[model samples]
Each structure stands twice: as C-alpha cells, then as structure tokens.
Target: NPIRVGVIGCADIAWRRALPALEAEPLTEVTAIASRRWDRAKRFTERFGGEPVEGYPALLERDDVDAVYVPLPAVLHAEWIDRALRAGKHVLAEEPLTTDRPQAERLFAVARERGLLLMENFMFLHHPQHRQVADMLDEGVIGEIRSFAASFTIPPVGGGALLDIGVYPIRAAGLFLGADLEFVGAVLRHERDRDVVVGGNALLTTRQGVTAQLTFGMEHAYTNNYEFRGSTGRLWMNRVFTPPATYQPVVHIERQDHAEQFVLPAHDQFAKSIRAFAQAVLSGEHPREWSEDSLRQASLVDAVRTGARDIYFP
Candidate 1:
C-alpha cells in the first residue's frame, strides 16, 4: 500500500524539487494538495494526481492521508506543524523549522509525545556528493582537521541574508565539524534599502577546536563552497549542488604527494529526500537525513542565531 501524503503550499521549490520526487516514490502517493486559494490547489492537484482541498485544515482532516509536507513560509512552520501533529499526521517541513530555539523545542517535544515524525527538510544532506565528502573527512582525507570554511550567498530576497542563504554555511560547518557550535565572533551589516543584511560574516568555534568561518549576504555574486584544511592536506568542493543541467561541480583534494579532482555523480537531491521521508513513514524507520541528523543541524542554527542576535539585523 502506498503511503498517502498531503502537501501544503506548492511554492516554486515544492514544484521544482519536492513534488516531482514525491510523485516518483513507488511507496508514496500524492493524495491531496492544499493551498489558500481553491483554484490554485485544484490546479496543483490536477497536475500531481491528488485531491484538491480548499484549505490546509480541510486537507489535514482527510482520513486517507498518512503524512504531510509543509513548505509554508518560515513564520508558519511551527503553527502548521503543531496543527498537523494534533490531527495525527506526520510532517516533513522545510528547513529552519522555526526561527528560534524555544518554538523548535516545543515542536520537537510535541512530536515526541505524539510519536509522530516531525522533520526539517534539508535535502542536500541526502545527495551522494555530501556523503562522499563526509567519508573522506572521516577517513582523515584532511588529516587532524583543524579548520573549515563554508559559505552560500545570493543577492537578497525579502528576508535578510543572515536567515536566508546564511543557513547553508552554518549547517555545513556543523555537519563537517560533527558537533554543536558556539559563536565566538560575528559582523552583520545592511546597506540602505537592502534586505537588512547586505553583508554578514561570523566565526564559530566548535567543540573539537574546529573553527569555521561563515560569510553570506544578499549583495554578492552567487557562491556556494566549502574548504577543509587539516594537518596533512586540504579538500575543497565548489557549488555543492548546482543544477545538473547547468554545471558539474568539482571536489578537489591536495596533499604533499598529489592533487586530484573528483566529479560527483549528479542526482535529484530533493527526490532522494522525499523518497527517504516516504520510506521512513512506511517502514517506521527513523529518517536519518531529515529527522535525527537535521535536528542536530537545527541545534547549530539555533546556537548561531542566539549568539549573533545582536548583530543579525543590523
């Protein structure tokens, strides 16, 4: 039997990445779609082979739906997630589950009590390239890892860069360091009429003495990259997940003996993520990428935001 799912909010990311993956999952079916506007929901349902619901509340009331993917805006995440759990539905929501620690902790506690899965979707973690990067690091490809640098930046959307693209590098730092972080220093700035963070940068010190530099903003050229340096060597990967049709990224390593580049196999990361979510729901398996692993990542985001609050919107 397919694990029936309801999707709330069919935004561009949902359409371009998630919806296709949900449709392709053999064990999951898109059984319902909800949008604030009935016509929009109807069109999305028609396109995705699901029932159209007039609103999110109507969709959650369905007896046939086993789970929901909530991609609502940042502010709506906790509200809708709590509602879905109360309605006895599992949820996989988009990243930064909540803007702050208290709400996220509350949602996690609720999900735990209900014994329902509540996940924050950070799709790139499932990409094979990231796995390869992790494997190399774990094997000490960069021996005695001392420091790392990661950044993801694109010129502003409505929200400030500190909360937008900045989350990516912060996440990467946490993942690579394999520990929670504490912010040691930060600088955030906004030029006139910018989305509040025209330039933002931070230095975080992890538990293992691995310091990371995160730089992101809305006023810069597009960039996404990470560099790991250790006692013996260095590893670099640029444009971690450029759309396959656009560019193939390079993972480079340098040491005293040799230097090499590996081209990671391109995969639809969002598809992988949705498939993992469906399998977890169907099999009662813990979603390593979306659930437990991402919870740890969210903790890091929480710490950074808390420590840097004073300069974040400046």
Candidate 2:
C-alpha cells in the first residue's frame, strides 16, 4: 500500500525536489498539500496532482494522509513535527531538525511513542556517491582513513549560515569521522547589523582520535567538496551536496605522485530519499539508525551553536 503523503509547506525545496519525487515514487502518493497562502498549494497540487488543503492542521486531519513532508523553515519544524506525530502522521522534514537539542529529542520521543517514522531529509545522505566512497574506504581505497575535511560555502543567504549551509558539512563530518564525536571548538562569524551568521569554521574529534575540519558560510563563491586523508592517498568528491539529477559526480584520488578520477552515474537524491521513506513506511520497519543519526546530528548542531566562540576575524 502506498503511503499517503501530505506536504505541509510551500517551501522551494518541496516544489523543486520533494514534491516531484513524491509524485514519481511508486510507494507514495501526494494526497494533499497545504500552504498558508492557499493558491500556492493550489498551484503545487495542480502541477503534482493532489488536493489543496487550506492549512497545516487541515492537511493533518485528513484520514488519507499517513505521512507528511515538511520543508518548512527549521524554526517551524519542531512544533509542526510534534503536532504531526500527535495526529498520527509520519514526517520527512528538512535537516538540522531543530538547532535546539531538547526540542529535537522531544519530537523524536513523540514519534517513538506514536509508532510513526520521523526522518530528517538530508537527501544528500541517500546519494550513492557517499556510500560507494564509504565502501571503498572500508576496503582501503584511501588506505587507513586518518582525517576528514569538508568545505561547503555559498553566496549570501539567510536563516544564519551555521544553521543553514553549515549543517551540510557538519552532517558530512559525522558521515566520515563517526557520530561519536566531541566538539572541540568553533568560530562563528556573524553580521552585527543583520544579526545573522555569514560563515564559520568548526572542529570535531571522534573517540578514535580522527578529526574533521568543516568550514561553511553563505558569503563566498560557491564551493562544495570533501576529502578523506589517509596514510597513502586522499579521496575527494566534487559537487558533494544538492547536485541536480543530470549531473554526473566525479570521485578524485591523489597519491604522492599520481592522481585518478572515477566518474559516477547521475542520480536524483531527492527521489532516492522519498523511495527509502516509503519502503520504511510500507515494510513496517522503522529504521532507528537514521533517527539516532538525526539526534546525534541535532546534538552536534546545538553544541556548535552554544559552544562556538563568537568572532569576526578576517
């Protein structure tokens, strides 16, 4: 049986990625889409083929909506996610679920209590590139993974860089370095007048003594890539996050004297994530691993926010 999904926002990500993937995925159906301003919902449903509901609550009240895809702002996620779980609906929401670890814990608690799935949709995690890289590393493609480094920066934006663009590299750090990490320190640079973070650098250390250096911001030329440094060679990836479906990704490696690149086939991560969510919903298998990953990632985001030293060093 297909999981009936109701998208709870008119966010651009949903329009561009989630909804289309929802429409395309076989095990899921977009039964409804709700937006504060009704016409956007109307337009969305017109394109995607679903009923247009008036508001979030109305969409949740539907007997047909077994799940909801929330692409709303991060600040709005905790409240609506909790409410959605209470309404007996699963959730696939955008990441950094909530920078507040307490609220994130509470929301996941509700999902556990209700026997519903609550997943943070970092679509990039579903991408095959990362998995292949991980497997190759395990097989010693990089030869004894010693360190990890990532940089994800973009043009000037909002919702604060740390909470916004920073989550990508932060989450990527966990993917490579291990989730059991201790926040050593970080420097978050903020715009005093706008009162928003534009960029920052963070350091995280795993128990095994491996460290990850993540630098992210929203006020620079677009740069997206990550590298795993090992005893012999280092493996690197380009367009590591949010690449379009048609673009093929290249994996590069550098040893002392030689370099090589592996070209990977194109994939739409959004569609992969939607299919995974549907499988979990249909197969009656709640993958707690992902939920735990979310909690740990949320905890790290909080640690980065609270423990970070505020500075504007040039």
Candidate 3:
C-alpha cells in the first residue's frame, strides 16, 4: 500500500518541493492538505490535487492519513509535531525541528514514547551526490581530509534568511565533518536592518581530527559551496541544492599538481527525499538518514543557534 500522507502548512516550500515530489513518488500519495488560512489551503489542494481541509487538526483527523508533513515556520514545528503524534501519526517536519534544545527534546520524547516517526526535513542529505562524495572521500580520492570550508548565503531582500538559510551551510559542514563535533567559538555580525545577526562564522573540530569552518550570511547573493583539502587532493562542490538552468550542481576534484573538473549527474534531491521517506513508511522501516541522523542535525542547528544567540527563522 502507498504511504498516505497529509500536509500541514501549505507554504511555498511545500508547493515547490514536497508536494510535487510526493506526487511523483510511486510509494506515496498526498491525501490531504491544510493551512491556517482557508483560502491558502484551498489553493494548495487545488494546485496539488489533495483534499482541502480548513485547518491542521482537520487534516490529522482523516482516517487514511498515515504520515504528516509539517512545513510551518520554525517556531511552530514542535507544537504541531506534538499534536500530530498525539493524534497517532508519523511526521516529516521542516528543519531545525524546534527553535531550541528544550523543544526538540520534548517533541522527540513524545514521538519516541508514541512509537511514531519524526524527521526534520533536510532534502540535500538524501541526494545521491552526497553519498558519491562520501565514497570518494572514503576511497582517499581526497587524500586524508584535513580542513573543510563551507558557506551558504542568501541575499537579504527580506526577513531572516540568515538564520533559516544559514542553517544549511552549517549542517553541510557537520555532514562533511562527523556529527560528533566539539564546538569552538564563533563570531557573529549584524549588518542587516534587523537587530538579529544576519552573518556569522564559526570553527569546529570533528572527531576524526578534521577541522571545519562554516560561514553563513543573509546579506549576500544566494551562494552555496564547500571545499575540502585532504592529503591526496581537494574537492569542491557548488550550488549544493537546486541548480541553475545552465549549470547542474558540480563537484570539482583537483590534485595538488593538476586542475580538472568532474561534474556529477543532476538529480532532484526533493524527489529523492520524498521517495525515501515514502519507502520507509510503506515498508515500516526507519530511515537512518531521515530519522536518527536528522535528530543529530537538528541538535547541531540548536547548538549553532545557541552559540550565536540568533533567533530562529520560520
């Protein structure tokens, strides 16, 4: 049977990524959609081909819904997720699970006690390119990884892009470096109109003696890139998420003496994530990447937020 899923908070991200991807997945079917605003919910359902509901609780009440996808702003995640679990449904939530550790702990505890799946949605990790990169590193393609540098920034035309979009680069660094990291100090700057720091840089130590540096800012143009220097060679990846029309996401490997570019085939990360989550739900299996690993990533996001004292972005 297909994994019957319902979506709460039908925002732009849900429309651009989750809804389309879920519809494309063979194992998944989006049964319903809801929003705080009735018109918004009606529009999402009309466009996405799901049953339109008045509010989140109504969507959860559907008997056919087995999984719930929560794309509400960062602050409302924990509360909505708790409500979903109490209603006896599994969930895939947007990243940073909660604004802080306490909320994350409480939500996770309830999900655990209820024996329900709870995942923070970080679609990039589910991309095959990530595994390919890991394999190359493991094969010593990049000789003994030494230092890692990663940056993800968005143009500050609007609200807290620094906090919401900034989280991506930091999470990428954690993925490249081991998650078991020792937090080092960080420097934060607020150049935007808002009082919150819209730019920050940090240095961290991973368990395998890898030193990682991450810089995130909302004041710059949208850019995502990462570079790793190892004993044998170096690896560089640009546009970690969705790519441009002309250039697909690229990973460049360079030897100390030679310069060459290797481009991995382009694939949809949102589709991969949706398919993986659907398969996990249908097969009654827990996804290592989506389930347990996501919690660790959420924890890391919390750590970075706490260290920087930057408010969470919805």
lDDT for 191 (candidate 1): 58
Tens digit of per-residue lDDT, candidate 3, span 1-314: 78889999987889988998888888888899998888988888888777888889998898989999998888788788999999999888877566765677788789889878787778887777777888888988878999898888777613344347666776787787766876676667765445666777777778777877888887778778888999888998888755532345567999978866767777788887787777766676865555455566666665665675443333
Put down candidate 1 lDDT per residue, 195-220, tens digits, no spaces: 36565788988777789998887778
lDDT of each: 0.78, 0.88, 0.77
Clashes of each: 1, 0, 3
- Candidate 2 lDDT, 1-314, residue by residue in tens: 78999999888988989989999998999999999989989999999988998889999899989999988888888889988999999988888677677888899899988889998999999899898888888987768988888899988724688887889999999887786988989999988877888999999899887888899998899999999999999999979988788889999998889998988889999999999999988887988889888888888988998899997644
Candidate number of the best TM-score? 2
Runs with alpha carbons beyond 4 Å of true place in candidate 2: 312-314
- The TM-score values for the models, in the order shown, are 0.89, 0.96, 0.90
Evaluated at residue 236, the lDDT of candidate 3 is 89
* Model 1 residue 163 CA deviation in Å: 2.8
In terms of lDDT, the best-performing candidate is 2
